[PDB]
Symmetry: D2
């Protein structure tokens, strides 16, 4: 390929810029041209396209967010929209596309290949909810953002404010909550992939309160419910003053950790390799500490799960 393109879609994840940097440098290394597609598939249809030079990625490896931006584009989820995209790619001489984003962005990667445009998906999201990869780019950073908040909460325990609820992201995937909860030494972790009894939870608060536990910290994945609601119900049920933190989109931001930069760099480069190998409709990932790549359709067909042992471990440790 003489020229490829790269875009980000699905909302920000720390390490997207590291991944863009890798795609650009890896391709330029092999003599390939790289074009930035701004604003995701929306910018693709709109022809918001511009060459990325070696220097254009020379100061971004440590930056959060994405220099290419992202934008939702339902228009691309249609035939006429995909056609506008294809047309814009051909007009710019772009022969293949690296798509960095969430599972949603993958669908578009697939369609493009079917119409003779090799596209490879790179997992950029904090959710860690993409099949065919143990870890998505940004998950590690989000975890550290979450434990930063948990650590600070540990300093604030008094006798009358001793119970804390922290709501983290994770609409369907409990990964953020589970890993954060374990690393944060949380007493209770509520996730969608595991059922919980609010009585067992309240019972656990009291047991801790009895043996003199300095603080009870409850981690709640957003997919399970509102931090505000859980906290209010707990206070209502126990008489214990309950304080609530809702991190929100903070979890998507900040400079990527070392693990995210490294993962981003490897997957990004791997994506370029696949295109040059003539492969397409593939997504990259890491599995058992090894770089893998799967057919998009096959990968998307699996169901994401969490490590139950780790969930169980977290209960033992508290």
């Amino acid at each position: 390929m003489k020229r490829i393109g790269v875009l980000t879609s699905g909302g920000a994840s720390p390490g997207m810029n590291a991944a863009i940097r890798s795609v650009v440098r890896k391709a330029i290394y092999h003599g390939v041209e790289v074009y930035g597609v701004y604003h995701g598939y929306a910018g693709l249809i709109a022809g918001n396209i511009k060459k990325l030079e070696v220097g254009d990625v020379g100061d971004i490896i440590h930056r959060g967010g994405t220099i290419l931006y992202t934008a939702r584009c339902p228009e691309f989820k249609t035939e006429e929209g995909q056609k506008k995209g294809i047309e814009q790619l051909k007009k710019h001489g772009i022969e293949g596309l690296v798509v960095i984003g969430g599972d949603g962005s993958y669908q578009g990667a697939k369609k493009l290949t079917e119409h003779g445009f090799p596209c490879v998906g790179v997992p950029g999201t904090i959710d860690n909810d993409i099949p065919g990869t143990d870890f998505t780019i940004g998950f590690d950073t989000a975890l550290n953002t979450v434990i930063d908040a948990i650590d600070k909460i540990r300093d604030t325990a008094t006798s009358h404010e001793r119970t804390y609820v922290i709501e983290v992201m994770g609409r369907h995937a409990g990964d953020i909550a589970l890993w954060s909860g374990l690393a944060g030494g949380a007493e209770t972790i509520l996730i969608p992939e595991a059922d919980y009894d609010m009585n067992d939870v309240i019972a656990r608060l009291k047991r801790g309160h009895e043996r003199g536990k300095k603080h009870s910290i409850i981690i709640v994945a957003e997919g399970v419910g509102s931090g505000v609601d859980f906290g209010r119900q707990i206070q209502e049920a126990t008489g214990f003053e309950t304080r609530v933190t809702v991190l929100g989109h903070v979890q998507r931001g900040g400079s990527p950790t070392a693990f995210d930069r490294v993962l981003a760099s490897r997957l990004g480069a791997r994506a370029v390799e696949l295109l040059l190998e003539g492969k397409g409709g593939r997504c990259v990932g890491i599995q058992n500490n090894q770089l893998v790549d799967h057919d998009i359709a096959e990968a998307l067909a699996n169901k994401h799960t969490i490590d139950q042992r780790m969930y169980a471990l977290s209960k033992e440790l508290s």
Copy 2:
């Protein structure tokens, strides 16, 4: 004096441990013993008191929280509680008490000295709402905790998600919201002191959406209302999708910044000087970048005010 005591009261504040360290080390340097009182005034009344050795404060300067803990004590708001408190101090041969905390800790200090027991207040709280000091110990750390959140939100630029409400601590004082908002480049800051026109907030929003502004960040002091409420109001009224962060007690936690450890070290040491030089019923502070102390009652009689020019400036820099 041969023996003094030290205690922490009110919410946790980053730098409390640095203040405790300073109290202990400054006293020991002058050949005075320091006894730790645990759990604030509740612990004082209960007699939860124990000598602090030089090594008990050797690894705390950089630690958040307070090794002495804090606990509510309504009883100490009565003659009975004050008497019990004094009984315990006397029983342990404690001749003066350094109290590190917020507004309500100072009331206890005033009452104590009105009862003939030497007591000095040190301003330990994040919300900068203590008389006789430009800055309380913990405020600067809290500010940095808030902008950490704001900075991360600036990395999340989705075209349809560019409106963010962040609820910070305040209640009565808008200092945290004001300083973190100015430092964080917030578009709008809602503080309890000033009036706000929701009409103005929305117009400023739209004005920024038109000009292509990538992030609209609104800081709301809890004293003004709930971030979630405002987020809903703003989305209902503009159709701009609005995301909300409520930081909560994260703002009280974490390792103190350099400024807070310095302030804490200087102020804790001064409180000791005041006790050893016969003074009492005073609180320490920093004003116009100078170490000061005041009669507690006199200081408590002044209303706290936010810097009005800084508020005005923040509005000039956003637009």
Copy 3:
């Protein structure tokens, strides 16, 4: 005036971007245009100049370094260079210049002012060594970068290997060393502004070890000497294993703290006010926690000092 300019000179300082943003926004608030001058005085001479739009500082408040870049320029020390600069300014319609930087950047502002061109200086450097201000923009951030290192070192103590020497920046000023050493609980601090005695030092270290002091941390301002050398000088004197950290230029990098962003915002805006009021040849600062401005020549005439009580306090607390 209807058009001003702004540039950055001297080493990079965290908060420079916050200052730039404030200059642009404040000017724009009063209907005035701002043109950025890139690569410092060098860029001013070479005519590297471009208008700054409101969107060009819309995302920098939290960024370290400077989007206008900085560079050395000996030519601007000469009258030919200075003239070529005004030439370039008047070519672009710039009626006043804001200069954000260290000592050196102030000389150029003096000269431009001697040549009848309205210029105001803003103190941007980490070493706190700029007259007419208690604190320079960047100082607070550097202290926090230093204590982050000191904090990590505390985690690595081991009774046999427990003596650490950290060398910090500050060419001729011991502010960084003094504040960071007080904030980090250092046992000993070496700065140009106070005589030291390695014997008095060695004894400290031993008395500390005698009573089982967990760790011994020594902070050394680079203007006093090398840390690697004080390290070697300390081992063969006590037999104590000694580790040395030299931080170097990390102290200049990083996102500015809340205090630096606030200072930078207040000083930047004040610099614009001065120009628009026709009051060039000044520098701005904060003194006794109030905003101030001074004639540059007069300010530069003042010698730099530190708070001796604070140095004395750090000695008292490290027992």
Copy 4:
């Protein structure tokens, strides 16, 4: 078992406390008592041992260092010391030992193992140089400490000072340098496990400035040489001003990252299970993202390697 023990040996490593916490909590869940052995093997021989209550580990998961302390012990490398150790263990009714530390600590585990005392090794070090595991507890945290410095150096840019040398830890392993180098966007990485042509290095450096590279960063593992010496070679060969930063022991310090805390928790817990399962003379680890365990002596026979494709990757990306 009714009662086991845990200690830490080798340098300090972030996550040791999370590991200690997990050993203690996991044991308690199974109704086993845990006794702390302070100061590693030195303390074991000396009988520096005390029961750890469930509350002794209640606030350490996020703390750097180790509450049990670490110490060197040549004595334990001898038959006599080993027996005194076992004697002290029996003396306290300790039936099994969890050893958290570096490969030095594993030797002692193997030895207590040849003596028929149940011991499980847990890999706690930053250099990632321990057999039977892809990652050691503390490695990830150290990487992030290194890139924090590299990131700040990026804010420090000029035409004059554009070349930076950073010396990082690792002992005999290049892992820290390779991973931090890749994560930090280093132009050149010098590690023990791969040959380097200094002229290629020099040539690559010039190649970069010719094309106006923002900053040139070079990472040097300490086991390859001295940062200061490389920086001199480079300034002398290019005339480019080269600033050296030697991070030193700061890399061992700080609060563990999420991954280190999770790793520590899992490996600590697994280590206890192995003792209760009547195993011993094993070390635990993570390989291919799965919990594993191996015979100590066997694992100790494997040579350390790094990912060479990763190394090549770093070369490709820094053009």
